[PDB]
Amino acid sequence: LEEAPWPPPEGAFVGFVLSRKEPMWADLLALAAARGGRVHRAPEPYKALRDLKEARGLLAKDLSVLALREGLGLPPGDDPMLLAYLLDPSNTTPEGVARRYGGEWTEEAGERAALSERLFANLWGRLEGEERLLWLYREVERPLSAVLAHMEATGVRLDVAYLRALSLEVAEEIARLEAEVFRLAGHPFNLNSRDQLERVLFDELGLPAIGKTEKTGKRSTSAAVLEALREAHPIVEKILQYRELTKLKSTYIDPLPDLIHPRTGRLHTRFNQTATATGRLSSSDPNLQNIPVRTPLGQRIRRAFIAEEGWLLVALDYSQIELRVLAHLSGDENLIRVFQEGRDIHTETASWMFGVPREAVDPLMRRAAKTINFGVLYGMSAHRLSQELAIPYEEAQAFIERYFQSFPKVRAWIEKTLEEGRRRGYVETLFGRRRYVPDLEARVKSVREAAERMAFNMPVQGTAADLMKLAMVKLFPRLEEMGARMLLQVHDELVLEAPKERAEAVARLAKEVMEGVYPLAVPLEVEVGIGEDWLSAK
DNA sequence: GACCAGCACCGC
DNA sequence: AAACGCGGTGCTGGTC
Ligand SMILES: Nc1nc2c(ncn2[C@H]2C[C@H](O)[C@@H](COP(=O)(O)NP(=O)(O)OP(=O)(O)O)O2)c(=O)[nH]1
Ligand SMILES: [Mn+2]
Ligand SMILES: [Mn+2]
């Protein structure tokens, strides 16, 4: 390409190099652009950002986030990654997309700009005729990237002092647990080492080995195994408690306070748009889509996520989302009637397994019911179900029988989905998002049946993701007009931040937008709450 | 220091 | 652990 002077013409494809993957923390090391057979390299990247009206190219969102960090309104536009991701969700990295569609992903901005131009031309050509995939690109993914950019650049407020004090408290308790484990073992050892713990439990203490690990075939010390051994030795109980606290302390309590950005004073995650096989987003650096919430200590961690002074958090979460999607996709009249009558399958399964009235079901019980309802739906075995439900194997097999017998159209849909996946080689969501599942024709049963479970799950989970994404695209401009912020997304949930005097109005509006994003054969219901912290708003 | 495989874990 | 699915992160143990 002919090297031309900065700036480039409007509509050029951008290429950029970051000192680190996180745009909110990265130094913009180089900036370049390409169009019309030319390449423009910026003398000073930061100054050069002011010259762009739109970020078109690979990882456009990341550059837009960095521009927002610097107070620049540089929205993301076309991104070859989103085109490749829609053609095949296994296209998740620029390294692979480049090598697959005509280029090489290097570490030079000028080459990345030229690569973005070449890959867009080729990928856009491959989507000619894919009307449904082009609709998802034009109406969902491309506009969503702008929404995610603003979310990432905004961040969430965290109660640092609260978590600092919590760290010191949990530390003392971990010391009491580790000292108790060492005494029962008769000697000290690295309790974090599952190899050393394996010997203590199964060689020294002589406890029975329940299961083995996948790759190396060692005797597993997983929670499920230890749960089965909860009454075989007092050490097992202390280990489970040690595992819980060290996990929450090492992954959330201690790391998150150190990630507050100096310029914003807030915590900034990344929402990765081409990371999953089903169309879901993912969150990383740090992951804010798996913040603790189940246990009492987990709830205390949620409370650390707070609203800015004078603001309130608004949390909206779809009710029984994939079950409602399943009703629409399958067309089972019985399942449809469940939601038309306002029933809650999670509560009903919870009341059955715990033997208590509906009003006695606590959040912990309901989460346990979710595992069963979705576990059974997506192919859980009676053997595992018997252990999860703590019932005889014969009763567990009966549970799976009544489950599908209650909704006979579900099985018919599963077989229709798998058959089409075998013939076409991919399954699709309600909006046409595809996932290629070639192992549906595999000759090894284990491999084949694994692909099958992945296959007919993707339309359900993927449609829910399509719906959530479309709702985010619709809702974002409405929140801007009301002075509200979109902070976090958790697959079927949104966390917003609104002025105290507008929180009620935002909550009502966001609820309506989410529930009416795309009318289905069943109503989409959203649970909404308002509070100064994430747990309160739930 | 950086990277990795493997086990284990958090929540959707 | 096991015939639920989708992710990301910490630790250990190992390498370079
Ligand atoms: N296969 C599978 N899918 C799951 C699991 N947990 C969550 N999902 C999927 C299916 C879920 O629909 C979706 C959202 O998870 P939630 O919002 O926590 N549960 P929901 O919306 O169903 O119920 P409600 O909001 O009334 O409490 O994530 C699981 O253990 N397994
Ligand atoms: Mn939900
Ligand atoms: Mn949810």
CATH code for position A259? 1.20.1060.10
Q: CA-CA distance, A128 to A111, in Å (whole number)?
A: 26
Q: CA-CA distance, A267 to A256, in Å (whole number)?
A: 8
Residue A371 Cβ contacting ligand 1 at under 6 Å: yes
Method of determination?
Answer: X-ray
Q: CA-CA distance, A178 to A276, in Å (whole number)?
A: 38
Residues A459 and A470 in one domain: no
Look at residues A419, A520, A507, A426 and name the one whose alpha carbon lies nearest to residue A466: A520
Q: CA-CA distance, A198 to A218, in Å (whole number)?
A: 8
Residues A430 and A346 in one domain: yes
The helix/strand/coil state of A476 is helix
* Residue of least CA–C1' distance to C4: A375
Q: Which nucleotide is nearest to A245 (CA to C1')?
A: B9
Protein-proximal nucleotides of chain C (any atom < 7 Å from a CB): 1-13
Residues A47 and A111 in one domain: yes
Q: What is the dihedral of CA A408, A436, A489, A373, to 10 degrees?
A: 30
Cis ω for the linkage preceding A188 (within 30 of 0): no
Matching residue, tokens 């000619």: A128
Q: CA-CA distance, A220 to A225, in Å (whole number)?
A: 7
Give the CA-to-C1' distance from A232 to B12 in angstroms.
33
Counted domains in chain A? 4
Residues A259 and A282 in one domain: no
Question: Residues 168-197 of A near strand C (Cβ < 7 Å)?
Answer: 190, 192-193, 195-196
Question: Residues 432-491 of A near strand C (Cβ < 7 Å)?
Answer: 449-450, 453-454, 457-458, 461
Residue A346 Cβ contacting ligand 1 at under 6 Å: yes
A269 CB neighbour count, 10 Å cutoff: 22
Q: Do A57 and A39 meet the contact criterion of CB atoms below 8 Å apart?
A: no
Residue where a domain stops, chosen among A153, A181, A207: A153
Residue A64 Cβ contacting ligand 1 at under 6 Å: no
What is the structure's resolution, reported in angstroms to one decimal?
2.0
Which atom of ligand 1 sits closest to the CA of residue A377? Answer: 1
Residues A107 and A137 in one domain: yes
Q: CA-CA distance, A355 to A186, in Å (whole number)?
A: 41
Give residue A379's identity as a one-letter amino acid code.
G
Look at residues A279, A260, A195, A300 and name the one whose alpha carbon lies nearest to residue A467: A279
Matching residue, tokens 């000290």: A188
Residues A337 and A458 in one domain: yes
* Residue of least CA–C1' distance to C7: A282
Q: What is the dihedral of CA A387, A376, A470, A515, to 10 degrees?
A: -90
Residues A417 and A524 in one domain: no
**Could you list which residues have their CB under 5 Å from ion ligand 2?**
A 317-318, 492
Residues A89 and A176 in one domain: no
Look at residues A350, A303, A15 and name the one whose alpha carbon lies nearest to residue A159: A303
For A523, residues 6+ apart whose C-beta sits below 8 A from its C-beta are: A324, A339, A340, A515
Q: CA-CA distance, A86 to A101, in Å (whole number)?
A: 14
Q: Is the CB of A275 under 7 A from strand C?
A: yes
Q: Cα angle vertex A315, ends A312, A318, to 5°?
A: 165
Domain that holds residue A23: 1-153
Pocket test for ligand 1, best of A322, A344, A373 (most atoms within 8 A of CB): A322
A127: exposed, middle or buried (Cβ count in 10 Å: 0-12, 13-18, 19+): middle
Q: CA-CA distance, A484 to A500, in Å (whole number)?
A: 10
Pull the structure tokens for residue A262. Answer: 């100096």
Residues A68 and A138 in one domain: yes
Over the range A211-232, which residues count as b (16 or more CB within 10 Å of their CB) and which as e?
eeeeeeeebbbeeebbeebeee
For A62, residues 6+ apart whose C-beta sits below 8 A from its C-beta are: A18, A23
Residue A318 Cβ contacting ligand 1 at under 6 Å: yes
Q: Is the CB of A92 under 7 A from strand C?
A: no
Q: CA-CA distance, A64 to A52, in Å (whole number)?
A: 10
Residue A453 Cβ contacting ligand 1 at under 6 Å: no
Residue A219 Cβ contacting ligand 1 at under 6 Å: no
What stretch of H or E contains A280? none
Expressed in angstroms and rounded, the spacing between residue A204 Cα and the centre of ligand 3 is 43
Give the bridge partners for A33, in sequence order: A14, A40
Protein-proximal nucleotides of chain B (any atom < 7 Å from a CB): 5-12
Residues A228 and A295 in one domain: no
Q: Do A339 and A322 meet the contact criterion of CB atoms below 8 Å apart?
A: no
Ligand 1, atom 23, residue with closest C-alpha: A320
Residue A469: give its domain's CATH number. Answer: 3.30.70.370
Give the CA-to-C1' distance from A282 to C7 in angstroms.
6
Residues A78 and A26 in one domain: yes
Residues A111 and A181 in one domain: no
Q: CA-CA distance, A222 to A206, in Å (whole number)?
A: 17
Look at residues A65, A68, A50, A62 and name the one whose alpha carbon lies nearest to residue A15: A62
Which atom of ligand 1 sits closest to the CA of residue A378? Answer: 1
Residue where a domain stops, chosen among A464, A483, A501: A464
Residue A104: give its domain's CATH number. Answer: 3.30.420.10
Q: CA-CA distance, A171 to A245, in Å (whole number)?
A: 9
Q: CA-CA distance, A26 to A47, in Å (whole number)?
A: 16
Residue where a domain stops, chosen among A445, A464, A483: A464
